[PDB]
Design a protein around this ligand. Structure first.
Ligand SMILES: Nc1ncnc2c1ncn2[C@@H]1O[C@H](COP(=O)(O)O)[C@@H](O)[C@H]1O
Ligand SMILES: Nc1ncnc2c1ncn2[C@@H]1O[C@H](COP(=O)(O)O)[C@@H](O)[C@H]1O
Ligand SMILES: [Zn+2]
Ligand SMILES: [Zn+2]
Lengths: 139, 139
């Protein structure tokens, strides 16, 4: 899977990513074509393609991780006032990487975003990791 | 809550909706301003506002229900080839109803959708309910 799927390769540590979150089942990385700074992908470590073949428990967990990252962005040095959470199920819904995943796109009041390059993704990653660490400390 | 929040009112049976799904914790209804036919909102029966105050278990479950509706749309007479799942967390992310909810927007190959009126929402509801009933029978 690692040699044929870029998200499997990243999960296996065989392809590069700016990683911001990881647990037993999910990996959160920065998108390489961010809509906004801190645009994050939540990627189940098991390869399935979309909503037709992904266990509900995986979709459920992916959403929960997405929430955690959303909360972090809102308290982070990226100054998020909100977030768009998205799953693009199938090619007709804009799917281009055929390993299921969920987007967390940080938003800011008056950002005039319409639905793609971050001047310093490493900084955005560091800010999100610091915010996630802070949420962890508070619990 | 029912008199001050339109989604609470719908959950309480105090305001109209075309309902397509219901369990102990969630209600799925047709959006009144659909992006596509069968555009569905999944609404937790408990009122919370966004990702900052909604229990993770609720976000997780909302996503699972959204998946079920997505799968139904794909096998339905609305002919969905895919779906966009969205949560708009906060006003900065386009939130306009301040009771947390999740969008399932059916998509079709070559539909040229860009991110709003259904000629027959009752028909779209009937088609989704029939597809959901069919998924239930298969399990
Ligand atoms: N190697 C990669 N690392 C990080 N993000 C990626 C990589 N390849 C593709 N993406 C992103 O994954 C998303 C896939 O699109 P979609 O399938 O519509 O969610 C896009 O936003 C891409 O920019
Ligand atoms: N009474 C209602 N019944 C069904 N859908 C509604 C109603 N009022 C608002 N909506 C929809 O709820 C969504 C709220 O926007 P957002 O908060 O961005 O998800 C919009 O797509 C509205 O068209
Ligand atoms: Zn994969
Ligand atoms: Zn409410």
């Amino acid at each position: 899977g690692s040699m044929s799927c870029v998200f499997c390769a990243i999960v296996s540590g065989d392809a590069p990513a700016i990683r911001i979150y990881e647990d037993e089942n999910f990996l959160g990385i920065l998108d390489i074509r961010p809509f906004t700074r801190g645009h994050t992908l939540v990627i189940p470590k098991t390869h399935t393609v979309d909503l037709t073949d992904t266990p509900p428990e995986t979709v459920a967990g992916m959403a929960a991780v997405g929430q955690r990252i959303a909360r972090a962005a809102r308290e982070s040095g990226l100054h998020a006032d909100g977030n768009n959470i998205a799953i693009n199920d199938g090619k007709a819904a804009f799917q281009t990487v055929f390993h299921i995943h969920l987007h967390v796109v940080p938003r800011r009041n008056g950002d005039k975003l319409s639905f793609r390059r971050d001047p310093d993704r490493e900084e955005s990653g560091r800010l999100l990791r610091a915010a996630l660490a802070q949420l962890d400390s508070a619990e």
